[PDB]
Amino acid sequence: PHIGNYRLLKTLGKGNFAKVKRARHILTGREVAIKIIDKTQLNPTSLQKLFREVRIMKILNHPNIIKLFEVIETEKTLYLIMEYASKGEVYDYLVEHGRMKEKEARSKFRQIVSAVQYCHQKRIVHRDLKAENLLLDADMNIKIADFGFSNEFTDTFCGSPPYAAPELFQGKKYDGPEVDVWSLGVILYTLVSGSLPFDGQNLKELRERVLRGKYRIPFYMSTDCENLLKRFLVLNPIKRGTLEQIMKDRWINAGHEEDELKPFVEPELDISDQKRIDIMVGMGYSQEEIQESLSKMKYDEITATYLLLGRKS
Ligand SMILES: C[C@H](c1ccccc1)n1c(=O)c(N2CCNCC2)nc2cnc(-c3cnc4cccnn34)cc21
């Protein structure tokens, strides 16, 4: 079971027309995650959605967002070779361990807010932020995943209802980032409490609770955490805080002297490490080939080998 330079191993999950498998890169030995998409079952609008997702992944380069390494395409199948996060979904972690202490939620939430604010810098809204789409790497760092429902902000999608902003329930047109801000308030509440702030026995009950916007504050929750939730979970999207403003909040930065959370500054990608390039020449690729794939940033077998050589094993 090979595809390109990858040996396919255990399945991580499976869904509508796709599965994700862990894999090993043969040339470097690094582990990756590969999404395998059966294109034959997709209609032309699903196909267009797929290629948009790929385009979004190429735009985004952040240490708390799953990175794209390579695209392999046949006429029947699309393979997205991605960063692997070995400790699974935040959702499953909360189920096993219960709520995080605020100091543990804070470390994760700073990473989440940095990643999503950076998406908004790039004019991308995720639109399906939920505990299930936050992965954890071997060091318990957050990696946001699955931009299959994401879009640019300049359709009639509504994500997981418990995380959906009230304007989505009323069927209202919406700009973009404000709905991610609301979902991040729901995420903060789930990290600190282990439960959702709005729930119901059915969609009607859940919808009514979201629109009322009331949620329970546990006795153990600090005043500063409660006040921060108020900046996310604002019914009026016009008055909802922006993430750049929320980054200055007291709770976000408690115990982070000299390290106030700030918008991420994307570094210039080094495509010129000759030690890595020397290794790839020894593997068989020519110097000129490596230069052309890296400069056009082709997400092909070469640029993926270069990136993976830049990561641990
Ligand atoms: C495929 C799916 C998935 C894909 C995208 C976003 C979230 C979840 N998935 C599950 O469904 C799941 N299940 C849920 C049902 N109960 C058993 C555990 N566990 C997972 C654990 N690790 C990953 C993972 C790790 N490195 C990466 C890099 C890219 C993508 N995925 N990925 C994905 C998982």
Swiss-Prot record:
Binding site for ATP: L12, G13, K14, G15, N16, F17, A18, K19, V20, K35
Residue ranges constituting the Protein kinase domain according to the UniProt record: 6-252
Tissue expression from the record: Ubiquitous.
Subcellular location(s) of the protein: Cell membrane; Cell projection, Dendrite; Cytoplasm
Sites bearing Phosphoserine, chain numbering: S313
Changes after translation: Phosphorylated at Thr-156 by STK11/LKB1 in complex with STE20-related adapter-alpha (STRADA) pseudo kinase and CAB39.
Origin superkingdom: Eukaryota
Domain UBA: 271-310
Known disease link: Visual impairment and progressive phthisis bulbi: An autosomal recessive, progressive disease characterized by poor vision at birth and development of bilateral phthisis bulbi by adulthood.
Protein family according to the UniProt entry: Belongs to the protein kinase superfamily. CAMK Ser/Thr protein kinase family. SNF1 subfamily.
Binding partners and assembly: Interacts with MAPT/TAU. Interacts with DLG5 (via coiled-coil domain). Interacts with STK3/MST2 and STK4/MST1 in the presence of DLG5. Interacts with YWHAB, YWHAG, YWHAQ and YWHAZ. Interacts with PKP2 (via N-terminus). Interacts with CDC25C. Interacts with KSR1.
Described purpose of this protein according to its UniProt entry: Serine/threonine-protein kinase. Involved in the specific phosphorylation of microtubule-associated proteins for MAP2 and MAP4. Phosphorylates the microtubule-associated protein MAPT/TAU. Phosphorylates CDC25C on 'Ser-216'. Regulates localization and activity of some histone deacetylases by mediating phosphorylation of HDAC7, promoting subsequent interaction between HDAC7 and 14-3-3 and export from the nucleus. Regulates localization and activity of MITF by mediating its phosphorylation, promoting subsequent interaction between MITF and 14-3-3 and retention in the cytosol.
Name assigned to this protein: MAP/microtubule affinity-regulating kinase 3
Gene that encodes it: MARK3
First and last residues shown, out of full length: 51 to 368 of 753
